C-alpha cells in the first residue's frame, strides 16, 4: 500500500491509516527519537509540519514540487492549534508570547 496524496480527517488535519481507506503510514515516537539521534532538523521539520499539518503550506509545497522548487515553509501545525483550543475550553488560559 502506498499513498502520495489523499483524504484527511475532520477532527484533526492528519492523513488516514490502512489499506481499505486511502491512508499513509504512522510515524511513531520511536522514529522521532531515531531521527533525533541523527541531526535530521529539516527531515523532522518536513515530517510532521508539511506532510500532515499546514493545510495552506502543503499546497504550496505541492505547487513548488510541480513547478520544480525543492523549498518548503515552516508554517504552523494545526494539531497545536487544536490543543490550544482544547485547553482554552477548560478553566486554564494559555497563549503565545512574542
Amino acid at each position: 500500500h502506498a499513498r502520495s496524496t489523499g483524504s484527511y480527517s475532520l477532527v484533526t488535519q492528519q492523513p488516514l491509516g490502512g489499506k481499505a481507506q486511502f491512508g499513509g503510514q504512522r510515524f511513531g515516537e520511536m522514529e522521532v527519537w531515531a531521527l533525533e539521534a541523527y541531526g535530521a532538523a529539516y527531515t523532522l521539520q518536513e515530517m510532521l509540519t508539511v506532510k500532515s499539518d499546514d493545510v495552506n503550506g502543503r499546497t504550496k509545497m505541492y505547487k513548488n514540487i510541480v513547478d520544480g522548487n525543492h523549498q518548503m515553509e515552516p508554517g504552523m501545525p494545526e494539531s497545536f492549534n487544536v490543543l490550544l483550543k482544547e485547553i482554552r475550553s477548560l478553566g486554564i488560559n494559555i497563549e503565545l508570547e512574542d
Binding site: 541531526g39 520544480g68 522548487n69 525543492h70 523549498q71
Partner: protein, 79 residues
C-alpha cells in the same frame, strides 16, 4: 561516488557542509548558476557535493561570491 567520507576530512563538522551544499544546489535550481564541474546525468545535490570536494565551493567562498554579486548589482543600479 557512493559515500560521504572525504567531505568530513575537508570540513570536520558534518553539519555546515550540508547547509552550504543546500545553498549551492538551491541557487543552481531556482536562480540558475553555471556548474563548475561536468555533470553526467546527476541531480543538483550530487553536483553541489562534488563541487564541495574539489574546493571551488566553500562557506566563505560562497559568502564572498554573494558579496561580489551584490556589489555588482549595486554598481549596476548606480549607473
Amino acid at each position: 561516488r557512493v559515500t560521504v567520507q572525504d567531505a568530513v576530512e575537508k570540513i570536520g563538522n558534518r553539519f555546515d557542509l550540508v547547509l552550504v551544499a543546500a545553498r549551492r544546489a538551491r541557487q543552481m535550481q531556482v536562480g540558475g548558476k553555471d556548474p563548475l564541474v561536468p555533470e553526467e546525468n546527476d541531480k543538483t545535490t550530487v553536483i553541489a557535493l562534488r563541487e564541495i570536494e574539489e574546493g571551488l565551493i566553500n562557506n566563505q567562498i560562497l559568502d564572498v561570491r554573494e558579496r561580489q554579486e551584490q556589489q555588482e548589482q549595486e554598481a549596476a543600479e548606480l549607473q
